[PDB]
Amino acid sequence: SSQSIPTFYFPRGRPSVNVDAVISKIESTFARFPHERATMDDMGLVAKACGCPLYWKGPLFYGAGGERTGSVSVHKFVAMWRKILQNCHDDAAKFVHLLMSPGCNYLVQEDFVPFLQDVVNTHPGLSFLKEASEFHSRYITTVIQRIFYAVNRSWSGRITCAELRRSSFLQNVALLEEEADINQLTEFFSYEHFYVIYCKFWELDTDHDLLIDADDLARHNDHALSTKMIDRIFSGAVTRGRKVQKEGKISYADFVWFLISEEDKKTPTSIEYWFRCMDLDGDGALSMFELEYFYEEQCRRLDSMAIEALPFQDCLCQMLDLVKPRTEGKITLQDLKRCKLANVFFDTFFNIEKYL
């Protein structure tokens, strides 16, 4: 039994690495520095001696306690990297253990800030943004939202080793040193994608409180989204907690999720976002009542433009052809992900601009 079925669950993680050789290399690298202390300016070299991509330099300096006084001793740096090397057996685990709060084994939004600060201070694509400023902070927030958007597929707000491993985020960290034009990295770090996103927010937040309400959000893209849908953003369908349901306001961070979901509705995250919004009673199926509720407004809007709307029944028939549900009588989340035209489905029910 315990021979034929060998142990298969490793709370630790499994696998081979010569830690003493890495330690040795770190030690002679620190021997180049005055007092054998590295500044943030030396951490590129240190990163390489650990065998990490350049842009791990911020997390490495921060993990070792460097920022406190602005330098870190060889002894202290070695102590923490040995510990990583002894307990973390792939990049995802290493990265989480560098940034995480002690004993967490997961990353929360705040944990990414030191990394992004270094990215902003270091990358030649972002040099105009080095100073403290409104744009500096928004960019950081925006990139982090986009990290959780793609990586944190459980919506838990805690990025896991498993989730990191399943994404392309670390590959992107590695590419930072190979691409001088940061807009070439479209998945997380793109400056121009941030700029578009922030402008869309800026022009709604006319009092500049970092808080947007249903009236504000309704103005977005010349009121392209229906009012019934705008309302659902404030319902608790897509936000943690009770604040949004009570205040009818969302933050900048929440707006980034809204905007990315609205720009691209074919994405597993966006499909989840809009399904949550459409499933009024939260039973896991879009019912005829739920579809009709959204569609009557589309009709009243098409009317105002002197365009004749498809009657609900013709529209429903088309939508059932489009999605091809697993079981008759229910449109489900799974059906929407598998059909590959979820964007067309969604626009038909709540977006006038894009449906046409």
Partner 1 sequence: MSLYPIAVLIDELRNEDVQLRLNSIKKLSTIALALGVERTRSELLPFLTDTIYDEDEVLLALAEQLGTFTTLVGGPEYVHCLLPPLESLATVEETVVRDKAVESLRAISHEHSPSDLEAHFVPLVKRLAGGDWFTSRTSACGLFSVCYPRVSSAVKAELRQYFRNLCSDDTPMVRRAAASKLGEFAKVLELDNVKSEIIPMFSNLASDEQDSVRLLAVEACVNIAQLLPQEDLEALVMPTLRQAAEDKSWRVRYMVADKFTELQKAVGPEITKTDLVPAFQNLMKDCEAEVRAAASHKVKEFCENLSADCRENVIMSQILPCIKELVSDANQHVKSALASVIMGLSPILGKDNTIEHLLPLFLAQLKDECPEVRLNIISNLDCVNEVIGIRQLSQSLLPAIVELAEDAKWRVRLAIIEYMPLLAGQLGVEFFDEKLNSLCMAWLVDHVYAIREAATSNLKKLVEKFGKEWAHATIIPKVLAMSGDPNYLHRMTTLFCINVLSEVCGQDITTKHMLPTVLRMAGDPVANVRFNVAKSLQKIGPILDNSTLQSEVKPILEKLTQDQDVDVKYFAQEALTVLSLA
Partner 2 sequence: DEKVFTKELDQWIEQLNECKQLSESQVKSLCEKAKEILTKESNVQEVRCPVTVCGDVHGQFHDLMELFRIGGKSPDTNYLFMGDYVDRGYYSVETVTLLVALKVRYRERITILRGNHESRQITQVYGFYDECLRKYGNANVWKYFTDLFDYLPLTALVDGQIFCLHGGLSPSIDTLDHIRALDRLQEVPHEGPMCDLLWSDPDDRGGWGISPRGAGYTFGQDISETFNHANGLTLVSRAHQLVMEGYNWCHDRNVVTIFSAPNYCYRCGNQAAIMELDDTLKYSFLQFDPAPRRG
Place of tokens 């709540």: 350
Q: Name the residue nearer to partner 1 (CB basis): 215 or 247.
A: 247
**Which residues lie below 8 Å from residue 188, measured CB to CB, with a gap of 6+?**
143, 146, 147, 150, 169, 172
**What ranges in 176-287 are assigned the alpha helix state H?**
191-202, 214-223, 227-233, 243-247, 252-263, 268-278
Spatial distance between the Cα atoms of 224 and 353, rounded to a whole number of angstroms: 5
β-bridge mates for residue 72, sequence order:
38
Residues 324-353 that bind partner 2 (CB under 8 A): 324, 328-329, 340-341
Q: Which does 5 bind (CB under 5 to 8 A by kind): partner 2, Ca ion, partner 1, none?
A: partner 1
Minimum separation from the CB atom of position 208 to Ca ion (A): 7
Contact between 209 and Ca ion by CB under 5 A: the answer reads yes
Considering the complex, what minimum distance in angstroms separates the CB of residue 139 from partner 2? 33
With CB under 8 A as the contact rule, which of the stretches 3-11, 49-57, 176-184, 315-323 interacts with partner 2? Answer: 315-323
Give CA–CA dist 90/80, Å, rounded.
16
* 292 lies in the binding site for Ca ion (CB under 5 A): no
314 sits near partner 2 (criterion: CB under 8 A): yes
Name which of 136, 125, 135, 134 is nearest 186 in CA terms: 125
Describe the chain by its helix, strand, coil percentages, rounded to 5: 60, 5, 35
Q: Which stretch binds partner 1 (CB under 8 A): 34-42, 57-65, 314-322, 327-335?
A: 327-335
254 touches Ca ion (CB under 5 A): no
Number of other residues whose CB lies within 10 A of the CB of residue 142:
26
281 annotated ligand binder: yes
Least spacing, CB of residue 55 vs partner 1, in Å: 26
DSSP state of 31: T
**174 vs 253, beta carbon nearer partner 1:** 253
CB-based contact 230:216 (threshold 8 Å):
no
- By the rule CB under 8 A, 310 interacts with partner 2: yes
Among 42, 163, 216, 262, binds partner 1 (CB under 8 A): 163
Q: Which of 87, 155, 178, 317 binds partner 1 (CB under 8 A)?
A: 155
Examine residue 318 and tell whether it contacts partner 2 (CB under 8 A): yes
DSSP-derived secondary structure letter, 150: H
The Cα 289–Cα 198 span in angstroms is 36
Is 205 a binding residue for Ca ion by CB under 5 A? The answer is: yes
Contact footprint for partner 2 (CB under 8 A): 310, 314-315, 317-318, 320-322, 324, 328-329, 340-341
Which residues contact partner 1 by CB under 8 A? Answer: 1-2, 4-9, 11, 153-155, 157, 162-163, 166, 235-237, 240-242, 245-246, 272, 279-285, 289, 332-334
